[PDB]
Structure 1
């Protein structure tokens, strides 16, 4: 049950952006702490 709740919270949370990224194979841009960006 606990595993289920974790996966679900991940799905409807802010994590949904990176989940949506993996499923759609869409590009995302990441601002990093090195002042470098990764698209």
Structure 2
């Protein structure tokens, strides 16, 4: 019974965003604590918000001796810790 209630609470709770993400294979963007952002598709998740992410594009912001420039790179198979997550946004 306990397992059931846990999965259900997960389903109708805030986690529903990441659950929806995996089932729809939709892209989501993740604001992290490193001040880097990860837009990707959710392959797997965890109660800690540990995740396996595919088609990762991380965007970030760097300062140089002139105007601030945004920098970005593609990481196809990315596994991510759960405490780095500030926010997970789901959008069209």
> Under a length normalisation based on structure 2, what TM-score does the superposition of the two structures give?
0.42
* Aligned Cα root-mean-square deviation (Å): 0.1
Alignment coverage as a number of residue pairs: 39
- Structure 1, unaligned stretches of length 5 or more? none
Greater RCO (Cα-Cα under 8 Å, separation 6 or more):
2
Q: For the pair shown, which has the larger CA radius of gyration, 1 or 2?
A: 2
Select the structure that is richer in helix: 1
Q: Which 4+ stretches in 1 moved above 3 angstroms? A: none
> Under a length normalisation based on structure 1, what TM-score does the superposition of the two structures give?
1.00
Select the structure that is richer in strand: 2
